[PDB]
């Protein structure tokens, strides 16, 4: 059955532009191993097909067979439920807390980057750093599967590659595109990088950057910087 993912186009109206929902879904369909097409949508010059398919204008959206699905959380849940085993791997996290760890990082970033109040900058920076810390703690805390892990290097320190264990799950598909925006935008416009001190966060990222499902679905750095330029330059 035809699977077509419609995603935000970038600055030339045709390549993949900034959108962490679009990347999340691209990652979910890559991980499922299904055959799909991805179509970019220049929201300033929508085609008549797109206009007819998705009158509301939500983006990203999914065309499945003849059915149109909107809202990323809904599209992911639908895909998880319809692209299911034996044919397709389940990608849902086993540990519910894998789906919440790091949930506030993107909101704290957005507040920090859109801020133009010089007196709030350090406060918002610290709010971003604390959210990254919560994530780091989740990543260095052994998961259930690792209880009293006989093979641990350090006592009570986790070794797994990703949020929920050693395989990418739907929780990584949500979080990783958001962290990529954070890293790209914060480096270009605030001179901010995630502290090397967050060792769980940097291990997670090195492992993710080594996977093509993540690396090959990232928009070009340039598109994210372009999308964030106006707001991130507000701070004087």
């Amino acid at each position: 059955p035809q699977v077509e993912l419609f995603v935000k186009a970038g600055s030339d109206g045709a390549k993949i532009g900034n959108c962490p929902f679009s990347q999340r879904l691209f990652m979910v369909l890559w991980l499922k191993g299904v055959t799909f097409n991805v179509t970019t949508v220049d929201t300033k010059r929508r085609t008549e097909t797109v206009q007819k398919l998705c009158p509301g204008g939500q983006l990203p959206f999914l065309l499945y067979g003849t059915e149109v699905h909107t809202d990323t959380n809904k599209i992911e849940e639908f895909l998880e439920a319809v692209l299911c085993p034996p044919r397709y791997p389940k990608l849902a996290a086993l540990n519910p807390e894998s789906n919440t760890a790091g949930l506030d990082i993107f909101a704290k970033f957005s507040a920090y980057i859109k801020n133009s109040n010089p007196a709030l900058n350090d406060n918002l920076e610290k709010g971003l750093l604390k959210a990254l810390k919560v994530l780091d703690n989740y990543l260095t805390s052994p998961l259930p599967e690792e209880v009293d892990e006989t093979s641990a290097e350090d006592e009570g320190v986790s070794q797994r590659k990703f949020l929920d264990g050693n395989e990418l799950t739907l929780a990584d598909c949500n979080l990783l595109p958001k962290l990529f925006i954070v890293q790209v935008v914060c480096k270009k416009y605030r001179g901010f990088t995630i502290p090397e001190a967050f060792r769980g966060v940097h291990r997670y990222l090195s492992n993710a950057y080594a996977r093509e499902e993540f690396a090959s679905t990232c928009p070009d750095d340039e598109e994210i910087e372009l999308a964030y330029e106006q707001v991130a330059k507000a701070l004087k």
Side-chain angles (χ1 to χ4, degrees):
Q2 322 281 35
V3 186
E4 189 179 4
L5 182 58
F6 286 80
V7 298
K8 174 65 150 43
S11 53
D12 68 353
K15 69 167 79 207
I16 283 204
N18 175 74
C19 177
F21 306 85
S22 292
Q23 195 177 352
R24 175 170 172 197
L25 301 175
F26 193 176
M27 291 183 68
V28 166
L29 297 157
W30 194 316
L31 289 166
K32 284 294 191 174
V34 70
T35 300
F36 63 108
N37 198 23
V38 177
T39 298
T40 62
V41 175
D42 182 342
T43 51
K44 291 173 209 152
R45 208 197 158 203
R46 286 177 178 260
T47 64
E48 274 146 80
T49 301
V50 167
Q51 302 178 354
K52 273 181 217 125
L53 291 181
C54 193
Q58 304 96 311
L59 202 66
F61 76 90
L62 176 79
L63 176 50
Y64 190 89
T66 60
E67 290 179 328
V68 159
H69 290 80
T70 60
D71 314 346
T72 300
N73 280 352
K74 300 181 170 81
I75 298 165
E76 183 176 82
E77 289 164 38
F78 171 80
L79 292 174
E80 175 74 342
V82 299
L83 298 166
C84 65
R87 272 171 99 193
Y88 305 104
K90 269 196 316 212
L91 300 171
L94 183 63
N95 300 115
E97 178 166 17
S98 287
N99 298 319
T100 56
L103 269 205
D104 55 322
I105 291 166
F106 196 64
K108 304 274 199 82
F109 156 70
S110 303
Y112 171 59
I113 202 70
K114 294 194 161 112
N115 174 56
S116 55
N117 196 331
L120 259 71
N121 184 78
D122 289 356
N123 175 78
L124 287 164
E125 188 187 329
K126 192 140 207 171
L128 177 55
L129 282 165
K130 293 185 156 79
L132 287 156
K133 252 189 276 163
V134 170
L135 173 62
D136 189 70
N137 286 351
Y138 187 72
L139 291 157
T140 60
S141 175
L143 287 162
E145 167 204 38
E146 300 176 296
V147 51
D148 304 327
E149 191 38 75
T150 45
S151 68
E153 179 186 313
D154 290 349
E155 300 152 4
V157 184
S158 182
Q159 296 165 143
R160 95 282 185 170
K161 294 168 42 177
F162 308 122
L163 283 164
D164 195 58
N166 291 318
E167 306 299 336
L168 291 162
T169 64
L170 295 183
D172 311 291
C173 298
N174 195 352
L175 179 56
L176 287 170
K178 284 168 178 170
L179 294 171
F180 186 64
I181 288 179
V182 171
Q183 286 189 290
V184 177
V185 176
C186 293
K187 182 176 306 140
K188 169 79 176 186
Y189 296 112
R190 292 274 185 283
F192 173 100
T193 58
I194 295 175
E196 275 327 295
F198 306 151
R199 284 173 267 284
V201 171
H202 279 286
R203 195 167 327 105
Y204 181 55
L205 293 171
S206 309
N207 281 305
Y209 281 109
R211 292 283 298 266
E212 63 178 335
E213 304 89 334
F214 172 57
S216 293
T217 51
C218 291
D220 287 332
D221 292 35
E222 202 201 21
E223 288 297 310
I224 299 171
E225 289 173 1
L226 270 72
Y228 278 88
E229 193 176 3
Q230 182 178 288
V231 294
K233 280 212 279 227
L235 189 59
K236 44 163 201 282

